[PDB]
Amino acid sequence: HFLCGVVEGFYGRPWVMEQRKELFRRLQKWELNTYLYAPKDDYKHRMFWREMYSVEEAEQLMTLISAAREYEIEFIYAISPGLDITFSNPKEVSTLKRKLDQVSQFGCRSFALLFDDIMCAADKEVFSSFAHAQVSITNEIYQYLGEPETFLFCPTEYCGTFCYPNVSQSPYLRTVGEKLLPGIEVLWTGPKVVSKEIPVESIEEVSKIIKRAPVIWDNIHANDYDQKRLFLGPYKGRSTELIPRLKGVLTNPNCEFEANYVAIHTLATWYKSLYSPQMALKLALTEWLQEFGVPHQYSSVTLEDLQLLADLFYLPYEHGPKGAQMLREFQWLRANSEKIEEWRSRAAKFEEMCGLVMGMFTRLSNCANRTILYDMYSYVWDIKSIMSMVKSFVQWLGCFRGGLAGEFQRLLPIDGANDL
Amino acid sequence: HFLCGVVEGFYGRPWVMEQRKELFRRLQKWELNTYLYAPKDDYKHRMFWREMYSVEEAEQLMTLISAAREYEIEFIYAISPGLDITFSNPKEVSTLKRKLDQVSQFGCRSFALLFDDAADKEVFSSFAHAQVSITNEIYQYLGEPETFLFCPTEYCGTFCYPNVSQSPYLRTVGEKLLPGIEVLWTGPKVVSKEIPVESIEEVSKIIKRAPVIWDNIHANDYDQKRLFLGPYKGRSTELIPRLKGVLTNPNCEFEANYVAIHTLATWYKSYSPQMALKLALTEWLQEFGSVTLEDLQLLADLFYLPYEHGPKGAQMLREFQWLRANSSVVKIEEWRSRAAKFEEMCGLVMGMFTRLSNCANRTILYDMYSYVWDIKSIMSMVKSFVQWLGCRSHSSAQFLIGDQEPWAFRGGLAGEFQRLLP
């Protein structure tokens, strides 16, 4: 059974139970089938992974695992012991069984052991390598829980760039593919952490070394790695030819829950297709518009508002066409500040485009869905403030920002080394 | 009778009732006394100011107004009609009376009309005449309440036209606003670095009363990457005898305003910014869990104040400016010794992030996580760059070798526009 859905696997404030239940509704509404629970800073998932859940947390996880069953989403419970586990100490192993047993009595039946970060001297004696230590404990938790239907394993070398010396010849992956039990699945993020493309030939290459088709943990829409970035563009860079070669695809999307309508809608479109990223974004935006109401009044947002907004917060390696256009046009205006009529005519057209950013922010702050507006607020306010300043500046040619973080970044020479 | 406390007055996600009750608890713990409710994006506070609250919204306001009394915090309800009100039309005035009447039946006794953002040319001779007419009539209609506030459109020095002393607008306001109504003022600027004593006497003369400061010193709603954990600073305690109050508009992240409100509380002793911050940091440390006192000293110095970095922050930046400026040399032992010590200081940022993400107080950590991770990753890159600069006596490789992850290039499309501004 091919797994396709969402992993909540980013850093920072995790989602809340009501947001996750609502996630289960949209996964079901769009015919996806999986949720992987792995919030990096939900303290009992990784930092304090040994602490069992309290009476009140047990009641919230049981309720959340029941909702996943109600909406026919498979619930996968992950745990990340890798930061301070002692693999050779029986009580660490018993604690890891005791804590999965407690989640198992909450209704959960599928699990994952993740090893995404960074070996003690006591385990150098018992285990021949880091890959042997993880595979030993993963296999033993696997068999100890009755060999569950779905059990996932995220390796430490979880992408091409993290493979040493490379994918095909890695000591680490080779031990994993040889000694990890055939029934356990392997997570893989592609050639990179955030893969621009995931080529079929790269998936073939990792499948030989790990001896099975991987489950993609996809970071295409993840935004936890830069405060100013948001990704509302379509699922893209993965050919539908990957589907016969994969055990599943689970996206790790933006931290702000309401901003992942497009990211999950288009992945669902891609899973059912063969696939046009631009057509997928138009179906996702057209459906999304219905959620931007006007408050009922007893005493606004357009489709082109959302097209502009997505083009300004698109994808990690690409801007949408309206974003690249306004940025190409402002480069030309700045560079060329007869030819005089051209400059003013194109400056006039560019201030109008700036006005459309201001107008999209204004109608978005009038919408009835306060949740969507709050999740995206700082991003939309920021792009509006800047374009209001850019617009002023274009007019001028015609007449501490960022904090300490910003001041250090301007002093690095690769500051705008990827600008257009 | 001096009002001092918090205005929740920023843009974006408002606080939830659980955070607000906890704010009242701290206002009381630290001897402050006032809360002004004015979140710009509570749709019924401003955008749809005429719409009554629903049965469930009403019940939430009553419970919260009751908690303010339990904690003896004065609750002031604000409203902003200025974006689309027709001041000269009676039905509009009634709409605003009925809407304040409804909050008044929730237990609320203090109010504010904010004007910080037609056919009225016929009835009113200026915009100040329009607002003061409706402000005075609302004021008396509610029985001249104990506290009634008025935020003018020219609410700071730079917003005054042509200047403070000569503004038609403020002088109309000072002449025609009833003595029982108070006037809000942010100082010489929206975010004032200092609020000089003579500026307050100058503004008090034209508005004919002592102002209540709406203080934006710690607001961070106007820049995504900014957080302000430094002490209340730039206002002499001499202002306390010439002010009717001070209400600070702090960071949008609720847990990040421990220092901002604690230090204002310390200052309300009718004052040393550095000493106030050592009291606030020592107390704040207790709410975590591990995090050390010098961690929070470092953290406050990296997110200090809108016009200043903390001493540990300003130090790492001039030192890295000098290292960058004199890298050509790589006599020469000076540059390497200072590069090692500066690499050591970056470690203290990394170590402060690590213990903060292992701390038991998850609420505080989630409020600041995006800010702490951003500074830690930049300094990790800044440390890498200094290492690269000293490793060049023996390597010709470039700083970035090959194909990068997206976080090597920061800011998205917004960042690309800002780099294009001079």
Side-chain angles (χ1 to χ4, degrees):
Chain A
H1 173 229
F2 186 95
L3 310 152
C4 187
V6 173
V7 50
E8 155 178 16
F10 47 80
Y11 291 89
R13 172 183 321 277
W15 295 331
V16 153
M17 298 301 197
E18 310 91 66
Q19 300 170 120
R20 308 174 161 143
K21 288 168 195 77
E22 163 76 9
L23 170 74
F24 302 164
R25 275 188 287 281
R26 322 182 168 179
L27 297 177
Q28 153 186 264
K29 183 188 168 188
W30 303 325
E31 291 178 67
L32 299 162
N33 59 45
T34 301
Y35 166 76
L36 171 60
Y37 167 91
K40 288 264 182 305
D41 302 299
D42 192 310
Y43 85 136
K44 300 249 180 86
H45 164 80
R46 167 176 87 110
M47 294 307 204
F48 309 153
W49 59 270
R50 315 171 163 91
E51 274 184 84
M52 321 288 146
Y53 293 100
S54 69
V55 162
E56 184 184 355
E57 293 157 346
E59 188 274 342
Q60 292 276 112
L61 265 179
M62 265 198 78
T63 309
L64 168 80
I65 284 152
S66 293
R69 204 163 92 77
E70 160 183 6
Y71 294 114
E72 322 184 294
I73 301 309
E74 155 156 42
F75 190 104
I76 308 165
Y77 182 86
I79 183 142
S80 317
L83 288 173
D84 59 354
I85 193 57
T86 304
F87 297 88
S88 66
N89 167 4
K91 170 169 92 116
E92 301 270 82
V93 182
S94 289
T95 302
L96 177 73
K97 306 184 181 160
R98 189 154 42 258
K99 158 68 162 289
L100 298 183
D101 272 334
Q102 177 202 16
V103 175
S104 155
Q105 323 162 318
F106 299 154
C108 174
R109 308 253 193 116
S110 317
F111 314 85
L113 280 163
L114 320 169
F115 297 105
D116 309 26
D117 282 340
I118 183 186
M119 197 165 171
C120 89
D123 305 339
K124 305 204 201 319
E125 211 41 87
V126 167
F127 299 101
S128 167
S129 74
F130 202 45
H132 288 73
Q134 294 157 357
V135 156
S136 154
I137 176 173
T138 309
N139 286 340
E140 149 163 14
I141 271 51
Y142 183 51
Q143 292 163 338
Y144 165 85
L145 298 163
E147 299 194 337
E149 169 199 11
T150 306
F151 201 88
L152 315 173
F153 168 83
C154 179
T156 309
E157 324 195 330
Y158 60 77
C159 60
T161 52
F162 275 33
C163 284
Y164 175 71
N166 56 22
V167 176
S168 59
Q169 296 164 25
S170 168
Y172 172 92
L173 285 180
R174 159 189 311 141
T175 300
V176 158
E178 276 161 8
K179 307 267 189 238
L180 196 289
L181 292 159
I184 306 160
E185 317 275 21
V186 177
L187 292 159
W188 183 254
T189 77
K192 296 163 92 143
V193 190
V194 189
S195 295
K196 175 155 151 285
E197 314 227 40
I198 314 191
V200 156
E201 156 186 7
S202 69
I203 293 312
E204 301 182 339
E205 170 184 43
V206 64
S207 301
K208 312 307 164 56
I209 175 81
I210 64 162
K211 291 162 134 86
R212 68 203 77 190
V215 176
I216 300 306
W217 173 310
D218 206 336
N219 290 310
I220 180 182
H221 285 93
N223 70 343
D224 56 358
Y225 55 77
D226 169 357
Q227 202 162 34
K228 288 173 67 80
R229 295 197 78 179
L230 187 69
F231 297 118
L232 313 171
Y235 192 72
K236 163 148 173 189
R238 299 81 176 110
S239 158
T240 49
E241 278 156 29
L242 298 162
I243 295 177
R245 321 236 185 167
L246 300 177
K247 183 59 214 197
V249 177
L250 311 164
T251 50
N252 185 39
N254 302 273
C255 303
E256 307 73 19
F257 174 87
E258 294 301 321
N260 304 125
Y261 200 98
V262 173
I264 309 179
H265 190 288
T266 54
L267 168 67
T269 289
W270 168 95
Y271 171 53
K272 306 185 295 220
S273 60
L274 272 179
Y275 173 73
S276 169
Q278 316 65 26
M279 274 185 257
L281 169 79
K282 162 160 167 192
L283 280 167
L285 292 184
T286 297
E287 201 171 305
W288 202 22
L289 176 66
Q290 282 320 297
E291 311 291 335
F292 300 79
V294 177
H296 297 164
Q297 284 151 264
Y298 317 89
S299 291
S300 207
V301 175
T302 69
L303 182 59
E304 305 72 48
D305 284 334
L306 307 182
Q307 293 168 178
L308 176 52
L309 169 75
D311 280 6
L312 312 153
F313 304 95
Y314 204 64
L315 294 169
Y317 300 95
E318 181 189 0
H319 307 300
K322 287 156 190 204
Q325 190 221 111
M326 308 176 70
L327 184 101
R328 243 182 292 110
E329 187 77 3
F330 164 67
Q331 268 146 212
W332 181 98
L333 290 160
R334 181 169 157 280
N336 311 332
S337 64
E338 47 157 342
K339 300 166 169 173
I340 292 315
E341 172 73 32
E342 186 202 359
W343 190 100
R344 292 195 185 284
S345 157
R346 306 215 311 171
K349 197 206 125 54
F350 171 82
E351 294 177 58
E352 190 172 340
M353 285 290 127
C354 292
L356 298 182
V357 178
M358 268 89 82
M360 164 267 289
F361 168 80
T362 294
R363 307 175 283 261
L364 186 83
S365 63
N366 288 123
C367 81
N369 194 330
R370 303 319 275 175
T371 319
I372 299 177
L373 163 74
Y374 300 157
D375 267 340
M376 305 205 297
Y377 193 96
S378 66
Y379 300 101
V380 180
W381 178 283
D382 177 69
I383 195 55
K384 157 211 80 150
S385 301
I386 294 158
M387 308 299 315
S388 177
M389 184 159 248
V390 158
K391 179 201 186 144
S392 264
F393 183 61
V394 169
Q395 280 182 3
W396 184 284
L397 294 171
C399 206
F400 275 114
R401 150 77 70 161
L404 181 77
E407 288 189 63
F408 272 110
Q409 178 188 336
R410 290 171 224 122
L411 288 175
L412 298 167
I414 45 85
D415 182 28
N418 200 49
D419 288 6
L420 306 196
Chain B
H1 218 344
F2 188 95
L3 306 152
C4 184
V6 171
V7 50
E8 163 179 12
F10 47 81
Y11 289 91
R13 165 169 7 248
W15 295 333
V16 303
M17 303 302 194
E18 183 178 352
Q19 295 168 306
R20 312 186 159 131
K21 290 169 197 76
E22 161 78 10
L23 172 72
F24 301 158
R25 201 199 84 207
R26 312 178 174 184
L27 292 179
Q28 159 190 271
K29 184 187 168 189
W30 302 327
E31 286 181 68
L32 300 161
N33 54 42
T34 304
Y35 167 77
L36 167 64
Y37 165 89
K40 293 270 181 301
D41 297 298
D42 168 40
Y43 70 126
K44 303 250 177 87
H45 160 84
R46 160 175 86 99
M47 291 307 200
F48 304 92
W49 60 270
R50 323 176 160 83
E51 298 302 314
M52 322 299 293
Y53 290 96
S54 67
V55 155
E56 187 50 63
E57 293 157 349
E59 193 275 342
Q60 293 273 109
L61 268 176
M62 265 196 294
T63 309
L64 170 80
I65 283 154
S66 295
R69 281 69 193 75
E70 160 183 6
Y71 291 113
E72 327 180 295
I73 301 307
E74 158 156 36
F75 188 100
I76 305 166
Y77 178 85
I79 184 142
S80 318
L83 289 175
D84 57 351
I85 188 148
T86 310
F87 291 86
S88 66
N89 165 357
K91 308 258 182 147
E92 298 269 81
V93 184
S94 288
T95 308
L96 172 67
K97 303 180 186 150
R98 185 145 28 270
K99 161 68 166 290
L100 294 177
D101 272 337
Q102 177 206 26
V103 177
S104 156
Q105 320 161 349
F106 302 155
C108 172
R109 319 262 57 102
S110 315
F111 302 86
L113 279 161
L114 321 177
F115 296 104
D116 58 59
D117 280 339
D120 304 339
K121 306 247 183 188
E122 320 296 300
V123 172
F124 297 99
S125 38
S126 75
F127 211 48
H129 289 73
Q131 306 162 180
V132 79
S133 153
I134 185 158
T135 312
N136 287 341
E137 151 162 15
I138 290 293
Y139 177 58
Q140 291 162 145
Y141 165 85
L142 296 108
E144 300 195 338
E146 168 200 9
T147 308
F148 200 93
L149 315 180
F150 172 84
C151 177
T153 309
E154 326 195 330
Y155 64 80
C156 62
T158 53
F159 275 32
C160 285
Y161 171 66
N163 58 21
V164 176
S165 296
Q166 297 163 25
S167 171
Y169 171 95
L170 283 178
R171 163 224 73 210
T172 304
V173 160
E175 278 161 10
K176 297 291 189 292
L177 192 69
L178 291 157
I181 308 158
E182 313 278 29
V183 181
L184 289 158
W185 181 254
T186 75
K189 296 159 100 102
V190 191
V191 191
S192 299
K193 174 154 149 110
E194 302 144 38
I195 311 192
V197 154
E198 57 280 14
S199 69
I200 291 311
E201 271 313 290
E202 169 185 36
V203 66
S204 302
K205 158 185 213 148
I206 178 140
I207 66 163
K208 290 160 131 144
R209 67 204 79 188
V212 174
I213 299 307
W214 174 309
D215 208 336
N216 292 313
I217 180 180
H218 284 93
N220 69 343
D221 56 354
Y222 57 88
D223 175 338
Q224 198 160 32
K225 289 171 67 82
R226 296 262 250 159
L227 191 70
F228 298 116
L229 316 170
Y232 195 73
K233 166 154 168 183
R235 301 81 175 113
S236 157
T237 47
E238 279 335 288
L239 297 155
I240 297 180
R242 299 97 185 273
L243 298 173
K244 180 56 213 195
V246 176
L247 311 168
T248 200
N249 183 220
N251 302 95
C252 294
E253 306 71 21
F254 171 90
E255 298 303 324
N257 306 123
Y258 203 97
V259 173
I261 311 176
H262 190 290
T263 52
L264 166 69
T266 295
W267 168 94
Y268 175 50
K269 304 316 111 164
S270 352
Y271 177 78
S272 171
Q274 298 223 128
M275 274 143 48
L277 167 78
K278 183 229 173 66
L279 284 175
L281 291 187
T282 300
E283 278 215 13
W284 198 21
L285 175 65
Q286 290 324 297
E287 311 293 341
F288 299 79
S290 72
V291 174
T292 68
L293 180 59
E294 304 72 49
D295 282 335
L296 307 186
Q297 292 171 359
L298 178 51
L299 166 78
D301 278 5
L302 315 158
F303 298 99
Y304 205 65
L305 296 165
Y307 303 98
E308 181 187 0
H309 306 296
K312 293 157 193 81
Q315 191 218 106
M316 310 174 74
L317 176 94
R318 52 177 143 269
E319 182 77 5
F320 155 77
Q321 268 150 14
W322 179 99
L323 285 161
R324 182 168 158 279
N326 316 336
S327 69
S328 82
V329 70
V330 165
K331 196 190 162 193
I332 200 182
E333 60 299 297
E334 185 200 358
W335 190 100
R336 291 198 184 282
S337 156
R338 308 216 315 165
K341 168 180 44 171
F342 165 91
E343 289 174 56
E344 189 173 339
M345 284 186 314
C346 292
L348 301 179
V349 177
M350 269 87 82
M352 165 265 291
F353 167 79
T354 298
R355 309 177 283 263
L356 191 81
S357 64
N358 286 296
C359 80
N361 193 329
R362 303 321 277 181
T363 318
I364 294 173
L365 164 67
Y366 301 160
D367 264 340
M368 306 207 297
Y369 189 89
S370 148
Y371 297 90
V372 176
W373 170 268
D374 174 69
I375 195 54
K376 168 265 174 193
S377 60
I378 261 61
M379 308 299 314
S380 175
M381 190 68 148
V382 161
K383 177 204 186 151
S384 204
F385 186 67
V386 164
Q387 282 169 1
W388 179 80
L389 290 171
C391 213
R392 288 212 300 161
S393 321
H394 52 255
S395 157
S396 187
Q398 296 149 314
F399 178 56
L400 296 181
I401 285 297
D403 176 78
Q404 301 297 300
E405 300 285 348
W407 52 80
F409 316 109
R410 306 268 265 172
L413 183 79
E416 288 192 62
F417 272 106
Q418 307 183 203
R419 286 168 218 124
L420 289 176
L421 298 164

mmCIF file of all heavy atoms in Angstrom, chain A residues 31-46:
data_model
loop_
_atom_site.group_PDB
_atom_site.id
_atom_site.type_symbol
_atom_site.label_atom_id
_atom_site.label_comp_id
_atom_site.label_asym_id
_atom_site.label_seq_id
_atom_site.Cartn_x
_atom_site.Cartn_y
_atom_site.Cartn_z
ATOM 1 N N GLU A 31 -8.395 12.459 -0.715
ATOM 2 C CA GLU A 31 -8.030 11.070 -0.986
ATOM 3 C C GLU A 31 -6.562 10.776 -0.679
ATOM 4 O O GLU A 31 -5.973 9.853 -1.244
ATOM 5 C CB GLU A 31 -8.370 10.690 -2.425
ATOM 6 C CG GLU A 31 -9.864 10.614 -2.672
ATOM 7 C CD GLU A 31 -10.234 10.272 -4.121
ATOM 8 O OE1 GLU A 31 -9.946 9.139 -4.558
ATOM 9 O OE2 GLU A 31 -10.799 11.141 -4.826
ATOM 10 N N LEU A 32 -5.961 11.516 0.246
ATOM 11 C CA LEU A 32 -4.691 11.065 0.785
ATOM 12 C C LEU A 32 -4.959 10.126 1.961
ATOM 13 O O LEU A 32 -6.110 9.931 2.381
ATOM 14 C CB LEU A 32 -3.815 12.243 1.194
ATOM 15 C CG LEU A 32 -3.469 13.153 0.019
ATOM 16 C CD1 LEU A 32 -2.964 14.558 0.488
ATOM 17 C CD2 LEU A 32 -2.468 12.452 -0.923
ATOM 18 N N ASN A 33 -3.894 9.488 2.476
ATOM 19 C CA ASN A 33 -4.142 8.340 3.344
ATOM 20 C C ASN A 33 -3.234 8.219 4.558
ATOM 21 O O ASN A 33 -3.365 7.220 5.278
ATOM 22 C CB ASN A 33 -4.065 7.024 2.541
ATOM 23 C CG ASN A 33 -2.704 6.795 1.867
ATOM 24 O OD1 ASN A 33 -1.636 6.984 2.472
ATOM 25 N ND2 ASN A 33 -2.745 6.377 0.606
ATOM 26 N N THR A 34 -2.295 9.153 4.780
ATOM 27 C CA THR A 34 -1.283 9.012 5.823
ATOM 28 C C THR A 34 -0.963 10.321 6.533
ATOM 29 O O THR A 34 -0.898 11.388 5.913
ATOM 30 C CB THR A 34 0.014 8.419 5.249
ATOM 31 O OG1 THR A 34 -0.265 7.132 4.675
ATOM 32 C CG2 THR A 34 1.098 8.302 6.329
ATOM 33 N N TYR A 35 -0.725 10.211 7.843
ATOM 34 C CA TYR A 35 -0.188 11.290 8.657
ATOM 35 C C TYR A 35 0.961 10.719 9.472
ATOM 36 O O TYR A 35 0.803 9.679 10.115
ATOM 37 C CB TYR A 35 -1.251 11.905 9.576
ATOM 38 C CG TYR A 35 -0.703 12.807 10.692
ATOM 39 C CD1 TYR A 35 -0.247 14.104 10.420
ATOM 40 C CD2 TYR A 35 -0.719 12.386 12.022
ATOM 41 C CE1 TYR A 35 0.201 14.933 11.424
ATOM 42 C CE2 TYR A 35 -0.271 13.209 13.043
ATOM 43 C CZ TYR A 35 0.195 14.473 12.741
ATOM 44 O OH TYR A 35 0.634 15.275 13.768
ATOM 45 N N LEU A 36 2.127 11.365 9.411
ATOM 46 C CA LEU A 36 3.283 10.932 10.188
ATOM 47 C C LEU A 36 3.555 11.996 11.243
ATOM 48 O O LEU A 36 3.851 13.153 10.911
ATOM 49 C CB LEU A 36 4.506 10.676 9.300
ATOM 50 C CG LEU A 36 5.863 10.409 9.980
ATOM 51 C CD1 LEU A 36 5.832 9.161 10.896
ATOM 52 C CD2 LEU A 36 6.976 10.255 8.915
ATOM 53 N N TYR A 37 3.459 11.600 12.510
ATOM 54 C CA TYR A 37 3.566 12.538 13.623
ATOM 55 C C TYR A 37 5.032 12.565 14.063
ATOM 56 O O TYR A 37 5.553 11.556 14.558
ATOM 57 C CB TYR A 37 2.621 12.103 14.757
ATOM 58 C CG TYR A 37 2.862 12.797 16.087
ATOM 59 C CD1 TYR A 37 2.189 13.990 16.405
ATOM 60 C CD2 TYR A 37 3.791 12.310 16.998
ATOM 61 C CE1 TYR A 37 2.437 14.660 17.617
ATOM 62 C CE2 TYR A 37 4.040 12.953 18.191
ATOM 63 C CZ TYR A 37 3.370 14.115 18.503
ATOM 64 O OH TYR A 37 3.663 14.705 19.710
ATOM 65 N N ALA A 38 5.717 13.708 13.844
ATOM 66 C CA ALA A 38 7.143 13.854 14.174
ATOM 67 C C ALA A 38 7.544 15.320 14.366
ATOM 68 O O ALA A 38 8.467 15.800 13.694
ATOM 69 C CB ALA A 38 8.034 13.199 13.103
ATOM 70 N N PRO A 39 6.864 16.076 15.233
ATOM 71 C CA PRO A 39 7.227 17.492 15.418
ATOM 72 C C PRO A 39 8.528 17.591 16.202
ATOM 73 O O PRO A 39 8.612 17.105 17.333
ATOM 74 C CB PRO A 39 6.042 18.066 16.205
ATOM 75 C CG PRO A 39 5.164 16.870 16.587
ATOM 76 C CD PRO A 39 5.912 15.625 16.263
ATOM 77 N N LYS A 40 9.551 18.216 15.595
ATOM 78 C CA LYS A 40 10.900 18.111 16.155
ATOM 79 C C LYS A 40 10.998 18.680 17.560
ATOM 80 O O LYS A 40 11.786 18.183 18.373
ATOM 81 C CB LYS A 40 11.928 18.817 15.277
ATOM 82 C CG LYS A 40 12.238 18.123 13.978
ATOM 83 C CD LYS A 40 13.484 17.255 14.125
ATOM 84 C CE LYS A 40 13.839 16.599 12.799
ATOM 85 N NZ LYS A 40 12.722 15.815 12.189
ATOM 86 N N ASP A 41 10.163 19.658 17.897
ATOM 87 C CA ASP A 41 10.253 20.304 19.198
ATOM 88 C C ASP A 41 8.996 20.116 20.043
ATOM 89 O O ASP A 41 8.787 20.857 21.013
ATOM 90 C CB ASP A 41 10.573 21.790 19.008
ATOM 91 C CG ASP A 41 11.873 21.991 18.244
ATOM 92 O OD1 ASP A 41 12.927 21.538 18.759
ATOM 93 O OD2 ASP A 41 11.834 22.556 17.124
ATOM 94 N N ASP A 42 8.190 19.097 19.757
ATOM 95 C CA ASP A 42 7.215 18.639 20.733
ATOM 96 C C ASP A 42 8.005 17.769 21.698
ATOM 97 O O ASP A 42 8.444 16.675 21.333
ATOM 98 C CB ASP A 42 6.073 17.902 20.045
ATOM 99 C CG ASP A 42 4.906 17.662 20.967
ATOM 100 O OD1 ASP A 42 5.129 17.151 22.097
ATOM 101 O OD2 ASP A 42 3.770 18.027 20.554
ATOM 102 N N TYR A 43 8.206 18.282 22.920
ATOM 103 C CA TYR A 43 9.286 17.799 23.786
ATOM 104 C C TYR A 43 9.282 16.281 24.003
ATOM 105 O O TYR A 43 10.351 15.654 24.039
ATOM 106 C CB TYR A 43 9.268 18.569 25.118
ATOM 107 C CG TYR A 43 8.352 18.070 26.223
ATOM 108 C CD1 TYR A 43 8.820 17.997 27.520
ATOM 109 C CD2 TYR A 43 7.018 17.726 25.989
ATOM 110 C CE1 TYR A 43 8.038 17.564 28.555
ATOM 111 C CE2 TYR A 43 6.205 17.285 27.038
ATOM 112 C CZ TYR A 43 6.735 17.205 28.323
ATOM 113 O OH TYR A 43 5.987 16.777 29.400
ATOM 114 N N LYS A 44 8.105 15.661 24.099
ATOM 115 C CA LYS A 44 8.085 14.222 24.331
ATOM 116 C C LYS A 44 8.352 13.413 23.060
ATOM 117 O O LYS A 44 8.503 12.191 23.144
ATOM 118 C CB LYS A 44 6.749 13.822 24.954
ATOM 119 C CG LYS A 44 6.436 14.505 26.308
ATOM 120 C CD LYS A 44 6.486 13.495 27.451
ATOM 121 C CE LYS A 44 6.185 14.092 28.829
ATOM 122 N NZ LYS A 44 4.722 14.140 29.159
ATOM 123 N N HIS A 45 8.420 14.052 21.886
ATOM 124 C CA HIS A 45 8.790 13.323 20.680
ATOM 125 C C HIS A 45 10.301 13.189 20.481
ATOM 126 O O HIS A 45 10.753 12.210 19.866
ATOM 127 C CB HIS A 45 8.172 13.958 19.431
ATOM 128 C CG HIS A 45 8.818 13.496 18.169
ATOM 129 N ND1 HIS A 45 8.509 12.287 17.582
ATOM 130 C CD2 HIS A 45 9.782 14.056 17.398
ATOM 131 C CE1 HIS A 45 9.243 12.131 16.492
ATOM 132 N NE2 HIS A 45 10.023 13.191 16.358
ATOM 133 N N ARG A 46 11.098 14.144 20.950
ATOM 134 C CA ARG A 46 12.519 14.065 20.629
ATOM 135 C C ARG A 46 13.396 14.438 21.826
ATOM 136 O O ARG A 46 14.214 13.629 22.274
ATOM 137 C CB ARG A 46 12.825 14.928 19.399
ATOM 138 C CG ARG A 46 14.318 15.197 19.112
ATOM 139 C CD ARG A 46 14.397 15.970 17.799
ATOM 140 N NE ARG A 46 14.262 17.414 18.019
ATOM 141 C CZ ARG A 46 15.229 18.313 17.883
ATOM 142 N NH1 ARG A 46 16.445 17.927 17.479
ATOM 143 N NH2 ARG A 46 14.964 19.613 18.102
#
